[PDB]
């Protein structure tokens, strides 16, 4: 059951899949990028210790230790009230483990031997060395007494050097914490080999165990029991004089770099149609948490992908760095804490911008009270705020004057007006779109440049994509995603000297891609994509293409046919020329033929038909696309030619040129690249859904009873809908 | 460096170089740093200009070296100039020490030492890489240049390298043969240079014996050039592929579109300066053959400019371009065995501070001798120049170094300078010990110091604010603890003497001398100690 997967100290709730719901705008919790939930899957990853060797004092001590420590646990169980007996079943209050070497079970014998080995072996595999204080510490063997009557009749006197004489360092405590969790990790791999898995309630028949959880998440009594036992063994270790020096706590901060998807910061701003040309305005930002946050005033040209304050378009302020941000970083102000409220006041007449933190107005390093001395009005300024990883904040534009926390004490007598002082409607929120979209390659784009080569009588029309920025300093070596705007539409119902009649009747379309010499073909991928493709990764391969196989059956259950779904269908050029002399003599030529009526994706390379092929559903958009990683200034080229008895791609794209064998490249067709920089518009209204568990009898209830509706402008060629 | 210049000419060139270098880029001038660290330690009359030039550079871009990231637009130190600057600072400091006291040179070099010390972070880990057989023999003292190559013929080339040589010799014949087929040289049995006809447009497997010597020579010595520096090569499998699938047919395969990584471009650059070295060496042999006529190309490789370098560097990396086109891969020959970051010895603070303690302990031995020397007739001791080197450089150098690195010696990984700048607790301990022994050095010799007593007083005074006395009481060596207690007892006896003099007469030649000694040294230092104890509640 699904309730069996909930984490122990966590409560199961039915919540919104998305972050933002219907609530009050000034209480709208703005969430930045989250942290990856990698720790949800519990994979025990302990340190390997077999590779190292252990010193001769360890060899001749691992037996005497093991003796003392196995007696050390028989001591604990006798204290708990244990009774020894010949039979094995501990449920019968009898078990043969209390007795000594020759007369305890030999498998437990060797188990104790090897666990002592791996303990003092991991003591060296954990980064700490150990060395005997002096030979006297081992030569002297004193024995403090434990009551023989309360101990069992076994002749050996149990108690060694007792619990006390050694001393505790926090280094030792942190050492034994991780040694105990490593012991649990070894136990966990043992249960994984047995096939055990985690479950809320322990089930031996179902291999369910609630104690198969990380060390910080275990149960306190058991973790502390094995803890006291383990470093009571460490008590014994320090008793025998083996002196250890702790490795220093190695400074290593992850700085919350790892985040949900690739987004590290999310920028929030008001609608561009609210910029203030002149006047004096007030605006507050509330910090629920303390983090790498930036609040200020942005120009309408602000790019969501760029960090706030790095350009002239942004005028922000950073908390922890105490950093005012505009075309660089210079010190200003103080760091905030959780619950701090920062009030931003802008004057558009004398070009002065100030901030107030918790009602007191900040000072920079200089004597100037204001942050940014002077600027140009330009096209206006709008409130803006960036949120870092695992950071939450609240934007209050002053829709209600009383909601502003510090406006009365500061900002009111000076006369700064709330940003929403005279607005009846709530201000629309615009934020960074997490999911990348495909847009036309801008001419000003420094990295990607596209040249349209007109097709001659002997040359097919060609679209060359070259990197002008390549060959220089600060360039980014990452895979780019390219595609053509016009799609190919498959037939709605699948049917079940070029010959001019065959060309007129056929529906097979063709385009070519030239892999320029010097460009690594393994970096380049050629094929078709659908509109659903919205995946951007630093490292792309054919194993990460999203696919699903819908198998439909009959009444008795036999799958009469199975259908495959995929947003991406490409091959790899590096594996495309296996023989060689497909690149060095002349650029690799990969051809893609698409059959609209049949639905087969076949790839032709240098006159040899590649074994890979794809079966596509009826009525599916297909966009020519090439995924390439830069290795040369000249990367690849879109040829629009046609092979023998195959209809050119322009006929498939444009319905007016349906019966035109001559290849065409109309101005509408152009190359688009995957780009993060875009804006998403928060709706002013959301569906109101209340969620509650009625009872244990009924379960969690969700209900929506009020309809909401929005107009959706559908772009035909892109197969995409906007608002 | 030239000697024909007048003093006015030598001043004008000084201002020109300083003005260019000031606004000039550090990535530019790191090239000049190599020949600077070889000439400045000599400490001749011509080093005056380099001293101030280096001072101004290291103060201009102090953040670039100090800040772990540096400026975003400017960048951060790549640690090879850091190693060079460490060698430079230590060489200047040592040789300056052995040199006799000249007031002008000393007051000109103290700011340089302070600037370089401030630029270098005290926690700097020197790279275990040292350089071999460098270019100082290339800019040797005799003739100001020597084109020494490495002994290539010592190296032997393996069988897979033979097989390389076969492939790349076929390819070189291809390049040679298209080049003159396009130029106008055409196939023909007759051999005429004027007629633009040669039989040499014919397949490599059949062509004459001539090319193998003059094709292998470039190749085989370019390969022994790998092996002298030892860079391991590998092969990809496409190379075995060409051989499996298998007068000449002219086919034009393109060359330049292939692009190369940064490390391999530097690789081609250094093997190219090897080519420049052999080239310039044989031009020099034919120059002593001619007797004279110093040709303009004899400037070193680093001095050599872009246009004269370009036709050379291109043919330099064409061989490696074909190397990883045809299916070969070259990697770095050497790997460092171990680099120790938690090591205490590699920290610049370590070597600097214990070398300073060695100097101050020597100075304490010298003041032990002066306990009877000042009682003796004259000061003229083997250490007059040595204690001068203290009194002008070392303690003022400590002043400048601490006013550059206030927070580093205060940050015990304990919140300030979050990016970096932690000074170890034991280094702090030995800092307190050097405080103690400097105090013992300065006690009761103020009259014996030649008006530099007030200088050392305020040096120890600001050092008394750069002190931290928490580390000493959490963790300390018994001797350092005993030194601190001895300084407490010196302060205790001084305070008792002051209460006594206040006990007979408080209103204000032995007594006059000791009261002047008090008012000059004691009062500032008691005030520093007391304010430190009060502000840190010690
Ligand atoms: N060497 C040993 N000597 C004595 N008893 C042992 C020894 N090894 C295991 N046992 C007993 O077997 C039990 C096995 O405990 P373990 O740490 O493997 O997990 P468990 O939670 O008991 O098992 P499961 O995960 O199958 O529910 C111990 O609690 C102990 O009672």
mmCIF file of C-alpha atoms in Angstrom, chain A residues 299-543:
data_model
loop_
_atom_site.group_PDB
_atom_site.id
_atom_site.type_symbol
_atom_site.label_atom_id
_atom_site.label_comp_id
_atom_site.label_asym_id
_atom_site.label_seq_id
_atom_site.Cartn_x
_atom_site.Cartn_y
_atom_site.Cartn_z
ATOM 1 C CA UNK A 299 14.362 47.751 -16.129
ATOM 2 C CA UNK A 300 11.855 46.181 -18.564
ATOM 3 C CA UNK A 301 14.786 44.706 -20.478
ATOM 4 C CA UNK A 302 15.865 42.499 -17.575
ATOM 5 C CA UNK A 303 16.823 38.946 -18.538
ATOM 6 C CA UNK A 304 15.473 36.235 -16.203
ATOM 7 C CA UNK A 305 18.480 33.990 -16.911
ATOM 8 C CA UNK A 306 21.075 36.552 -15.803
ATOM 9 C CA UNK A 307 21.761 37.075 -12.110
ATOM 10 C CA UNK A 308 20.336 40.278 -10.641
ATOM 11 C CA UNK A 309 22.863 43.087 -10.258
ATOM 12 C CA UNK A 310 25.450 41.895 -12.781
ATOM 13 C CA UNK A 311 24.197 44.205 -15.555
ATOM 14 C CA UNK A 312 23.134 47.827 -15.895
ATOM 15 C CA UNK A 313 19.512 46.688 -16.213
ATOM 16 C CA UNK A 314 19.358 45.592 -12.565
ATOM 17 C CA UNK A 315 19.698 47.604 -9.344
ATOM 18 C CA UNK A 316 19.597 45.144 -6.437
ATOM 19 C CA UNK A 317 20.900 44.625 -2.896
ATOM 20 C CA UNK A 318 22.271 41.452 -1.289
ATOM 21 C CA UNK A 319 21.778 40.506 2.352
ATOM 22 C CA UNK A 320 24.546 38.158 3.483
ATOM 23 C CA UNK A 321 27.236 39.831 1.388
ATOM 24 C CA UNK A 322 25.915 43.230 2.543
ATOM 25 C CA UNK A 323 26.271 44.003 -1.132
ATOM 26 C CA UNK A 324 24.590 46.566 -3.360
ATOM 27 C CA UNK A 325 24.483 45.236 -6.908
ATOM 28 C CA UNK A 326 24.682 47.195 -10.156
ATOM 29 C CA UNK A 327 27.323 46.382 -12.794
ATOM 30 C CA UNK A 328 29.391 44.748 -10.071
ATOM 31 C CA UNK A 329 29.436 44.380 -6.302
ATOM 32 C CA UNK A 330 30.311 47.081 -3.762
ATOM 33 C CA UNK A 331 29.699 46.945 -0.025
ATOM 34 C CA UNK A 332 26.494 48.427 1.397
ATOM 35 C CA UNK A 333 24.459 47.869 4.518
ATOM 36 C CA UNK A 334 24.075 44.946 6.897
ATOM 37 C CA UNK A 335 23.082 41.297 6.699
ATOM 38 C CA UNK A 336 19.476 40.408 7.471
ATOM 39 C CA UNK A 337 18.034 37.536 9.494
ATOM 40 C CA UNK A 338 14.852 35.493 9.296
ATOM 41 C CA UNK A 339 11.779 37.716 9.528
ATOM 42 C CA UNK A 340 13.606 40.869 8.437
ATOM 43 C CA UNK A 341 11.682 43.298 6.221
ATOM 44 C CA UNK A 342 13.465 45.506 3.684
ATOM 45 C CA UNK A 343 11.736 48.583 2.283
ATOM 46 C CA UNK A 344 12.868 49.883 -1.104
ATOM 47 C CA UNK A 345 12.234 53.562 -1.884
ATOM 48 C CA UNK A 346 13.009 54.996 -5.327
ATOM 49 C CA UNK A 347 12.905 58.613 -6.434
ATOM 50 C CA UNK A 348 12.644 59.102 -10.209
ATOM 51 C CA UNK A 349 13.172 62.880 -10.089
ATOM 52 C CA UNK A 350 16.623 63.283 -8.497
ATOM 53 C CA UNK A 351 17.613 59.694 -9.428
ATOM 54 C CA UNK A 352 18.180 58.468 -5.865
ATOM 55 C CA UNK A 353 17.418 54.977 -4.562
ATOM 56 C CA UNK A 354 17.364 54.017 -0.884
ATOM 57 C CA UNK A 355 16.679 50.957 1.259
ATOM 58 C CA UNK A 356 15.432 50.617 4.844
ATOM 59 C CA UNK A 357 15.933 47.450 6.896
ATOM 60 C CA UNK A 358 13.414 46.860 9.707
ATOM 61 C CA UNK A 359 12.612 50.578 9.749
ATOM 62 C CA UNK A 360 16.177 51.930 9.932
ATOM 63 C CA UNK A 361 17.767 53.434 6.835
ATOM 64 C CA UNK A 362 21.010 51.816 5.711
ATOM 65 C CA UNK A 363 24.488 53.317 5.319
ATOM 66 C CA UNK A 364 27.147 52.280 2.812
ATOM 67 C CA UNK A 365 30.926 52.467 3.261
ATOM 68 C CA UNK A 366 30.823 56.128 2.232
ATOM 69 C CA UNK A 367 28.944 58.840 4.087
ATOM 70 C CA UNK A 368 26.190 58.880 1.461
ATOM 71 C CA UNK A 369 22.865 57.767 2.905
ATOM 72 C CA UNK A 370 21.521 56.635 -0.480
ATOM 73 C CA UNK A 371 22.575 53.510 -2.370
ATOM 74 C CA UNK A 372 22.890 54.453 -6.060
ATOM 75 C CA UNK A 373 24.001 58.010 -6.768
ATOM 76 C CA UNK A 374 22.442 58.859 -10.144
ATOM 77 C CA UNK A 375 21.173 57.047 -13.231
ATOM 78 C CA UNK A 376 19.087 57.604 -16.367
ATOM 79 C CA UNK A 377 15.306 57.309 -16.486
ATOM 80 C CA UNK A 378 15.369 55.156 -19.615
ATOM 81 C CA UNK A 379 12.176 53.159 -20.112
ATOM 82 C CA UNK A 380 11.205 52.960 -16.424
ATOM 83 C CA UNK A 381 11.734 50.747 -13.400
ATOM 84 C CA UNK A 382 9.686 47.925 -11.869
ATOM 85 C CA UNK A 383 10.073 46.066 -8.548
ATOM 86 C CA UNK A 384 12.148 42.897 -8.823
ATOM 87 C CA UNK A 385 13.411 40.145 -6.529
ATOM 88 C CA UNK A 386 15.624 37.078 -6.944
ATOM 89 C CA UNK A 387 15.354 34.012 -4.714
ATOM 90 C CA UNK A 388 18.149 31.513 -4.178
ATOM 91 C CA UNK A 389 18.112 27.805 -3.453
ATOM 92 C CA UNK A 390 15.680 26.867 -0.664
ATOM 93 C CA UNK A 391 14.715 30.502 -0.104
ATOM 94 C CA UNK A 392 11.245 31.973 0.443
ATOM 95 C CA UNK A 393 10.069 35.580 0.504
ATOM 96 C CA UNK A 394 6.984 37.777 0.353
ATOM 97 C CA UNK A 395 6.351 40.747 -1.951
ATOM 98 C CA UNK A 396 4.092 43.500 -0.595
ATOM 99 C CA UNK A 397 3.407 46.260 -3.122
ATOM 100 C CA UNK A 398 1.239 48.294 -0.754
ATOM 101 C CA UNK A 399 -2.133 47.380 -2.218
ATOM 102 C CA UNK A 400 -3.395 48.136 1.289
ATOM 103 C CA UNK A 401 -1.504 50.912 3.065
ATOM 104 C CA UNK A 402 -1.941 49.317 6.504
ATOM 105 C CA UNK A 403 -0.353 46.024 5.399
ATOM 106 C CA UNK A 404 3.020 47.756 5.026
ATOM 107 C CA UNK A 405 5.007 47.004 8.173
ATOM 108 C CA UNK A 406 7.383 49.987 8.406
ATOM 109 C CA UNK A 407 5.846 52.477 5.954
ATOM 110 C CA UNK A 408 4.483 54.699 8.726
ATOM 111 C CA UNK A 409 7.782 54.997 10.606
ATOM 112 C CA UNK A 410 9.804 55.391 7.396
ATOM 113 C CA UNK A 411 8.663 56.333 3.895
ATOM 114 C CA UNK A 412 5.415 58.116 4.802
ATOM 115 C CA UNK A 413 6.617 61.501 6.079
ATOM 116 C CA UNK A 414 9.167 61.674 3.261
ATOM 117 C CA UNK A 415 6.126 61.138 1.041
ATOM 118 C CA UNK A 416 7.096 58.019 -0.905
ATOM 119 C CA UNK A 417 3.990 56.459 -2.376
ATOM 120 C CA UNK A 418 3.207 52.734 -2.176
ATOM 121 C CA UNK A 419 3.654 51.078 -5.554
ATOM 122 C CA UNK A 420 -0.021 50.028 -5.482
ATOM 123 C CA UNK A 421 -1.401 53.170 -3.820
ATOM 124 C CA UNK A 422 -3.872 53.936 -6.620
ATOM 125 C CA UNK A 423 -4.541 50.564 -8.272
ATOM 126 C CA UNK A 424 -7.810 48.645 -8.071
ATOM 127 C CA UNK A 425 -6.551 45.376 -9.579
ATOM 128 C CA UNK A 426 -3.756 43.188 -8.248
ATOM 129 C CA UNK A 427 -0.433 43.594 -10.034
ATOM 130 C CA UNK A 428 0.443 40.698 -12.324
ATOM 131 C CA UNK A 429 3.488 38.619 -11.378
ATOM 132 C CA UNK A 430 6.049 37.595 -13.999
ATOM 133 C CA UNK A 431 8.668 34.962 -13.170
ATOM 134 C CA UNK A 432 11.322 32.831 -14.840
ATOM 135 C CA UNK A 433 9.995 29.895 -16.828
ATOM 136 C CA UNK A 434 11.631 26.732 -15.499
ATOM 137 C CA UNK A 435 10.984 24.720 -18.655
ATOM 138 C CA UNK A 436 13.158 25.814 -21.606
ATOM 139 C CA UNK A 437 11.480 26.848 -24.848
ATOM 140 C CA UNK A 438 12.576 26.991 -28.482
ATOM 141 C CA UNK A 439 12.980 30.466 -29.991
ATOM 142 C CA UNK A 440 14.621 32.068 -33.017
ATOM 143 C CA UNK A 441 18.401 32.536 -32.927
ATOM 144 C CA UNK A 442 18.944 36.274 -32.313
ATOM 145 C CA UNK A 443 21.463 38.086 -34.487
ATOM 146 C CA UNK A 444 23.031 39.771 -31.452
ATOM 147 C CA UNK A 445 23.577 36.334 -29.865
ATOM 148 C CA UNK A 446 27.343 36.140 -29.363
ATOM 149 C CA UNK A 447 27.652 32.338 -29.473
ATOM 150 C CA UNK A 448 25.340 31.027 -32.214
ATOM 151 C CA UNK A 449 25.282 32.523 -35.713
ATOM 152 C CA UNK A 450 23.165 31.170 -38.581
ATOM 153 C CA UNK A 451 23.859 31.881 -42.263
ATOM 154 C CA UNK A 452 21.249 31.222 -44.947
ATOM 155 C CA UNK A 453 22.976 30.056 -48.140
ATOM 156 C CA UNK A 454 20.825 30.480 -51.241
ATOM 157 C CA UNK A 455 20.550 27.322 -53.316
ATOM 158 C CA UNK A 456 21.971 27.583 -56.823
ATOM 159 C CA UNK A 457 20.920 25.472 -59.809
ATOM 160 C CA UNK A 458 23.554 22.900 -58.797
ATOM 161 C CA UNK A 459 23.379 23.517 -55.023
ATOM 162 C CA UNK A 460 20.513 22.819 -52.648
ATOM 163 C CA UNK A 461 19.468 25.640 -50.287
ATOM 164 C CA UNK A 462 21.489 25.373 -47.091
ATOM 165 C CA UNK A 463 21.325 26.711 -43.534
ATOM 166 C CA UNK A 464 24.743 26.834 -41.856
ATOM 167 C CA UNK A 465 25.056 27.116 -38.071
ATOM 168 C CA UNK A 466 28.497 28.358 -37.019
ATOM 169 C CA UNK A 467 29.902 29.574 -33.697
ATOM 170 C CA UNK A 468 31.554 32.967 -34.123
ATOM 171 C CA UNK A 469 32.448 33.158 -30.424
ATOM 172 C CA UNK A 470 34.356 29.878 -30.668
ATOM 173 C CA UNK A 471 38.135 29.995 -30.589
ATOM 174 C CA UNK A 472 38.229 32.607 -27.796
ATOM 175 C CA UNK A 473 38.370 33.211 -24.040
ATOM 176 C CA UNK A 474 35.321 32.729 -21.724
ATOM 177 C CA UNK A 475 33.486 30.592 -24.351
ATOM 178 C CA UNK A 476 31.129 27.877 -23.064
ATOM 179 C CA UNK A 477 31.681 24.298 -24.270
ATOM 180 C CA UNK A 478 28.180 22.866 -23.872
ATOM 181 C CA UNK A 479 25.744 21.068 -26.143
ATOM 182 C CA UNK A 480 23.253 23.292 -27.932
ATOM 183 C CA UNK A 481 19.842 22.185 -29.211
ATOM 184 C CA UNK A 482 18.706 23.224 -32.707
ATOM 185 C CA UNK A 483 15.544 22.674 -34.751
ATOM 186 C CA UNK A 484 13.560 24.018 -37.701
ATOM 187 C CA UNK A 485 10.286 25.874 -37.164
ATOM 188 C CA UNK A 486 8.143 24.133 -39.783
ATOM 189 C CA UNK A 487 7.032 20.599 -38.796
ATOM 190 C CA UNK A 488 6.137 17.533 -40.862
ATOM 191 C CA UNK A 489 2.607 16.209 -40.359
ATOM 192 C CA UNK A 490 2.101 12.454 -40.521
ATOM 193 C CA UNK A 491 -0.979 10.952 -42.146
ATOM 194 C CA UNK A 492 -4.113 10.830 -40.006
ATOM 195 C CA UNK A 493 -4.934 7.203 -40.902
ATOM 196 C CA UNK A 494 -2.087 4.880 -41.848
ATOM 197 C CA UNK A 495 -2.761 2.837 -44.963
ATOM 198 C CA UNK A 496 -2.434 -0.909 -44.448
ATOM 199 C CA UNK A 497 15.654 9.944 -63.754
ATOM 200 C CA UNK A 498 13.095 10.324 -60.979
ATOM 201 C CA UNK A 499 9.713 8.876 -61.900
ATOM 202 C CA UNK A 500 7.443 11.912 -62.057
ATOM 203 C CA UNK A 501 4.292 9.940 -61.226
ATOM 204 C CA UNK A 502 6.018 8.349 -58.225
ATOM 205 C CA UNK A 503 7.190 11.771 -57.041
ATOM 206 C CA UNK A 504 3.665 13.191 -57.384
ATOM 207 C CA UNK A 505 2.001 10.314 -55.528
ATOM 208 C CA UNK A 506 4.613 9.719 -52.822
ATOM 209 C CA UNK A 507 4.703 11.314 -49.369
ATOM 210 C CA UNK A 508 8.324 10.596 -48.412
ATOM 211 C CA UNK A 509 10.329 13.685 -47.435
ATOM 212 C CA UNK A 510 14.079 14.169 -47.073
ATOM 213 C CA UNK A 511 16.582 16.603 -45.591
ATOM 214 C CA UNK A 512 20.341 16.379 -45.116
ATOM 215 C CA UNK A 513 22.849 17.445 -42.471
ATOM 216 C CA UNK A 514 26.543 18.067 -43.197
ATOM 217 C CA UNK A 515 28.971 17.474 -40.339
ATOM 218 C CA UNK A 516 31.813 19.842 -41.166
ATOM 219 C CA UNK A 517 35.366 18.448 -41.024
ATOM 220 C CA UNK A 518 37.065 19.030 -37.691
ATOM 221 C CA UNK A 519 33.762 18.824 -35.793
ATOM 222 C CA UNK A 520 33.498 15.786 -33.530
ATOM 223 C CA UNK A 521 30.537 13.786 -34.908
ATOM 224 C CA UNK A 522 29.927 11.933 -31.638
ATOM 225 C CA UNK A 523 29.002 15.357 -30.262
ATOM 226 C CA UNK A 524 26.382 15.759 -33.011
ATOM 227 C CA UNK A 525 22.970 14.062 -33.083
ATOM 228 C CA UNK A 526 20.674 14.207 -36.128
ATOM 229 C CA UNK A 527 17.000 13.300 -36.304
ATOM 230 C CA UNK A 528 13.440 14.375 -35.582
ATOM 231 C CA UNK A 529 11.827 15.748 -32.419
ATOM 232 C CA UNK A 530 8.242 16.452 -31.413
ATOM 233 C CA UNK A 531 6.764 19.510 -29.726
ATOM 234 C CA UNK A 532 6.842 17.753 -26.344
ATOM 235 C CA UNK A 533 10.656 17.775 -26.261
ATOM 236 C CA UNK A 534 11.513 20.195 -23.449
ATOM 237 C CA UNK A 535 14.599 18.532 -21.947
ATOM 238 C CA UNK A 536 17.846 20.472 -21.508
ATOM 239 C CA UNK A 537 20.876 18.646 -20.105
ATOM 240 C CA UNK A 538 24.601 19.351 -20.028
ATOM 241 C CA UNK A 539 25.264 15.765 -21.107
ATOM 242 C CA UNK A 540 22.879 14.188 -23.607
ATOM 243 C CA UNK A 541 22.761 10.620 -24.896
ATOM 244 C CA UNK A 542 20.259 8.296 -26.538
ATOM 245 C CA UNK A 543 19.681 6.578 -23.181
#
